[PDB]
Structure formats: C-alpha cells, structure tokens
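Hi everyone,

Forwarding the result from last night's run.
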Amino acid sequence: GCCCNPACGPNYGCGTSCS
C-alpha cells in the first residue's frame, strides 16, 4: 500500500493506518 522503506524513494511518510 503506502510506501515506508527508503528504497521506495526520498520520502515515504509511512502512516500508522497505512502501514
């Protein structure tokens, strides 16, 4: 779903609801 890891890009902004 929502990006969390750094590999994804410069910013992921992982959210608690969208972990």
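DSSP finds no helices and no strands in the chain.

Cheers,
N.
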